[PDB]
Amino acid sequence: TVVVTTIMESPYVMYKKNHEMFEGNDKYEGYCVDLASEIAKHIGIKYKIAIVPDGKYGARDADTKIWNGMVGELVYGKAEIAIAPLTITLVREEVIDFSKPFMSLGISIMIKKPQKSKPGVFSFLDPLAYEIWMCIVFAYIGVSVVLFLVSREFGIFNSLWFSLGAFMQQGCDISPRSLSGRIVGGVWWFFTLIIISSYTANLAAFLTVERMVSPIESAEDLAKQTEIAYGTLDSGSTKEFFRRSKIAVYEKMWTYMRSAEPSVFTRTTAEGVARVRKSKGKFAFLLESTMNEYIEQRKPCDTMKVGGNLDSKGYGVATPKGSSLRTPVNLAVLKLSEAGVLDKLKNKWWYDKGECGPSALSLSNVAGVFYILVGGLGLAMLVALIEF
Amino acid sequence: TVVVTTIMESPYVMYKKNHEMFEGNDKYEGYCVDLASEIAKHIGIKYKIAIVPDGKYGARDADTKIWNGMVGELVYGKAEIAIAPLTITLVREEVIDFSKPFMSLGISIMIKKPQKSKPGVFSFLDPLAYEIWMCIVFAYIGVSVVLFLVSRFNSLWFSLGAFMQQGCDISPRSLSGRIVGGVWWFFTLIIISSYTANLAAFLTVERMVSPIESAEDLAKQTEIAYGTLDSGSTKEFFRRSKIAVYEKMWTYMRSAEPSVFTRTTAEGVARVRKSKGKFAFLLESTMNEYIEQRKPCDTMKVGGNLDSKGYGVATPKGSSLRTPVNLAVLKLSEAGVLDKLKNKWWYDTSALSLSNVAGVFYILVGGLGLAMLVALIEF
Amino acid sequence: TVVVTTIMESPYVMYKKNHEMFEGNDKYEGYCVDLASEIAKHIGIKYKIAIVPDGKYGARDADTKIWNGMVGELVYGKAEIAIAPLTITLVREEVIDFSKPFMSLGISIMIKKPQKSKPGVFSFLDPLAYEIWMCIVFAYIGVSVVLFLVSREFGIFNSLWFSLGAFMQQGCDISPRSLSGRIVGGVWWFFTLIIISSYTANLAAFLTVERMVSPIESAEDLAKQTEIAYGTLDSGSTKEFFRRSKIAVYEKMWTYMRSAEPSVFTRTTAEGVARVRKSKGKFAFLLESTMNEYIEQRKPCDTMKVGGNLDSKGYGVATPKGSSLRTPVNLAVLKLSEAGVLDKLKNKWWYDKGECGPSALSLSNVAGVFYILVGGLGLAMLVALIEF
Amino acid sequence: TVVVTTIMESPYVMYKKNHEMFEGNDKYEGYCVDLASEIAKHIGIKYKIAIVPDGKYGARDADTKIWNGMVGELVYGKAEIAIAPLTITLVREEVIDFSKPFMSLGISIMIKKPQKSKPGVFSFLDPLAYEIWMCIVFAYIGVSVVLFLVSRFNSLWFSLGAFMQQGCDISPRSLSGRIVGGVWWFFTLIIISSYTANLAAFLTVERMVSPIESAEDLAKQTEIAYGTLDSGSTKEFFRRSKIAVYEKMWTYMRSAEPSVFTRTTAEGVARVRKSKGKFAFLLESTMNEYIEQRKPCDTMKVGGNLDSKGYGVATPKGSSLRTPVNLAVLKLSEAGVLDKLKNKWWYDTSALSLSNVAGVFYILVGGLGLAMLVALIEF
């Protein structure tokens, strides 16, 4: 029975919910658990699923050169095949034989979802700072009274009506027919015109800039701006990609990361994911494309994928140099890719089994006006009854 | 000397402008030629560049079972190392040994860059969501009712004038009825400013959003016809597909007249443009990007790669250079050479017309025409 | 008498206006003609000004390696010193001895001056295409007449007044008091509101974009956009700077130039200068900083300098390897730079002798309204007299 | 081994973060160290890096006539090749032989990046040029006169209301007088829209223009005090200057109390910031750019280089490496190395408050206060 060496990394492999009830190769489920099954079916090789005792993908001990993880299991002749998300890299392929890629991974940017749906009820006041709304109400009462004094028709219940009507630019009523009174109206009209023009102009400024801001969609975008903090992992090739790169865009990124504080290199991948979710659109974690898609397709469904692939990588099946099954596996992997079976399994374990299946002004943006209108009309009805 | 073989498929291989003066391997320029140098320099091997005579990539002629094109040259000893954009397939792999993919491609969607959209009839409502417009009418009725109800203790005419920044017909004198007027005067002010301001962003900033944004979207929309190649790998990929998305595409294409399957690539690249964006092409992700960055630069790309393929260097069974070459490819990929070459060779207001606001002239004409009927009805 | 070899390139050297009347070293004038004089004064070496018979700065014959121009004169022992704008380059300094730079030149971008001062009289109509102004006048007459028909107070001389007043949003007059008539007013008011709001919104779009456009001020700016066509000269180091460069910004520029058509490499420097002047802000010639400043400081005074120096170069005095005057000249050049004499001469020949010594809305931008207002009031006066 | 000498003037030389672990030439990082490598590799020479003990650049002590600092080390055989930002001067050149300038610098102007400007009292007039505002008043008088003149065949009140998008007091019924009203109603409409639209661009787009834009400008303006160094080359450059621009600067500084000449560089870099932009520093064009790209990144640069200087590598008289080094410098300059190193080590809306519109509240308060007097005068 061929000994398989796979790694416990969702969704590729993950123990079943009620796994204690099961035994053997049936206790495990995951993308890899279907890939190995399908490959066996074609070739015809009994496969006993075994788990990497340690939990490392593979990296020769810097001190003793000893191979670790499943890469070590293969070379040391303890596992005849390796079905896992094992990247095709020199060091690895220098000791083992890799199958043609089954999933072209790459680098991708993770950010939080827009979630920009909190238009406060009183959002029609943002252009003009409340301190001016406190200075208008006073000025209005301050102006209305002066129009009464200098005119003693223009009583104290009609002056408030003229001043209020003049400010809203829909007022005719009765015009001041005294030179002294007309002075008050003229300055109030000039005061009215500036405020209305200022409010209209400033409001357009708020909307256009919010319409011009765009989310990051490329590597240049993430680097040209330093507002969002973009970090990777301390270990792994997620950062090495830049420690020996040559493209200007990448070179700049490395500089920012190695300088910005605190440590952008999160201790673990799980930390980076949480950081983005708990930063309100201020941290952009960098992780492999495959795992990036998985995270976005699970609850709380707040992360997202932007752009494409900065680099080009690929996974594959692994076998020791000189295995009796180097051609059969390679042909079977190609046969699955042509038949679309890899896309079927990818869809199943990423979307089908994903808990989450899939410019204009809204009423909320102007909710404050519609509320002070229903309440205002409600105040009137009371008055009409109280006077009655 | 090693007789390398490739194909004159731009931008992978092309003839240098001054091809007549140049001699030897220097006569040809492209991505493959640069890639060839990177490999040779690594393995220290003298290599001569040749071109396949029939220009075919490789397809076994079942009638004769003789491999044609580049794949044929390799299996019959007439070639050496095909450094060409040859896709990795099962049938090819049975006769030749490929290398680890230098670059990865996938079927894509090819459409013309979105040109200025035709202004819809009622395009003068965009600043405020159509929902709001309904609530504005509902609020107009609300206030108009209150005015009458309060007064009993011309209302519609007053409210209509106040909303549209016009003069006031009358002036309420009661406290009960002045509150109703003041609030509405304010409500409309915010609206008028909200419409005017938002309408400015719509004109200042342009977006020209593309209709098709992914694969699924394209399939559903029937207006935008999508055609592949009559003999390309794409057509086969769909025929043998069972993913509902691609399934529906087959059905559509099977009964899509006039025939959408362009004979060659040239035909498709032209047809797409001359169709004003009503036609879409499904080709590889490499030639698509090249065209988008090739004059007149009028086509675009939308949607993720439907299926994953891979271009690879091929070697005859048992070639002594199989491992040297493979390892050299991987070295370039980690060093960024495979990407430096690819990026280099591939990538390196308005006055408002009548159409934008036409809608209101239809309302006006209608209004000033319906008005007449009312007089006829009355008298 | 020390033989000097200078080049006829303004303003460094240029024959006097009435030069035929003069002879000897007094016939020539220019920046270099003062530099050589000042150096002599300090050292004390009789200098006979001689002109390079050919007219080439210096470049060994690709076929015969023979040195040409003043660089050839020095090596071949025909000139003891070379006072000229001779750049300090390897090839040259490998055969002759250069003095410490007297003028730090570099690369610079030449463009035409803004000259954006042509606001047509009728510029208040740009936001709304004339075709809509033709559709408003008709609609106005079309609406005014319908208000008359359905109401037969609202005659034919008062309906034109109400319709005109309603459109300008300053009208009260008399309100339609018939349900049939009120329908006409309501739609006209809705028609009025949209046009005014559309005009105000669209006008803001024109101004903000014209306020956001900015002239090129760096090398990235010129490359990121392909609207302006930037070219150099076919010969000279003005283009070589990029044929072997390594900076991304520069590498991109070379690509554009070698591809864009027609030939961006102007036959001569004079062609490039004329091209910019005769392209309406569409050609950006690239030339040395020193000559760039000179051109901008001469009639018709239309070119300009933007940005700084993409590279770093330097001129100097030249002498043959082993000249009896290598230290005296070098010390004298440094003595002039400290004393500010070089800046004095630079100012004199670039600015002092330069024929050219050195956001808001203007009345022109709204000139059409003020004209149709004076004429309109002039029409009224006629009517008032004709009726009288 | 060659004992190279330099100076710990950042960014030219600095200690690597992990200096304690590193040994030898690797302990120091900077521009000079990178430049040293480029030269050594070219000339194939083993070089050891040393630091000048007293940190001085070089100034002859007239009392003893002994050269100090880096220049002293060279002339006294205790050093070799000073690859340092040593400026080329006449006195230095008499004892040491420099190289062709690797990089060129010049005196500059150092100011704090322009922060949001305080809103002027009458900042509500910016959209329309102050000229227009005058002609608007002139046009108001023009029409008001015509109305009376025409009618004779309240005028000021009508015109004032019409201009400020308010209601109409009356309605002229004569053709003679209706023309006068219609044109003004139109004129104001264009103005109101022109003000509202232009005011939007002023808020949307921000410019934050810097007060000082060149040398001449700085000299004239007295508010923005400009100070140099108490012992730096700059101070000497001005003292011996006769260009009117710099002349005036000397006069100002000679009687500029409190003393503007900052003792060190650090003091100037701080003083400039803590002065909220009222103080300006005149330093070199190299340290200025470094600070602008150094945290907290709050300073800026304005104006062209007042005078031209040059940093150069120095050699003792008759050094056998004088020509090798010089030629190596020129090679780097043409190859772009001198610039690659320099660029790398150096460079690598809002809600309107009351202040913006305050002016109108002063007009209003004034108007509603002047109005009262008129009543007192009348009665």
Ligand SMILES: NS(=O)(=O)c1cccc2c1c([N+](=O)[O-])cc1[nH]c(=O)c(=O)[nH]c12
């Ligand atoms: N899960 S992960 O967080 O994205 C992730 C992070 C870091 C390294 C990974 C890795 C994954 N992976 O995708 O499972 C596979 C993989 N394969 C290799 O061969 C290797 O060397 N490193 C990795």
Ligand SMILES: NS(=O)(=O)c1cccc2c1c([N+](=O)[O-])cc1[nH]c(=O)c(=O)[nH]c12
């Ligand atoms: N250029 S194309 O129009 O998109 C295109 C269209 C159709 C078939 C192609 C093809 C390209 N290509 O891109 O390089 C390569 C390629 N290679 C093979 O081996 C093969 O069988 N068919 C093809």
Ligand SMILES: NS(=O)(=O)c1cccc2c1c([N+](=O)[O-])cc1[nH]c(=O)c(=O)[nH]c12
């Ligand atoms: N005048 S120019 O049109 O700008 C100009 C154009 C082309 C080459 C120039 C050059 C100038 N120059 O500035 O006088 C000096 C100079 N010096 C050299 O040593 C050399 O090789 N080439 C040149």
Ligand SMILES: NS(=O)(=O)c1cccc2c1c([N+](=O)[O-])cc1[nH]c(=O)c(=O)[nH]c12
């Ligand atoms: N860093 S600084 O604050 O602008 C500065 C201020 C003052 C003197 C400096 C100087 C620098 N510098 O820039 O490198 C170099 C330098 N070199 C000399 O030889 C000399 O005498 N004085 C100086």
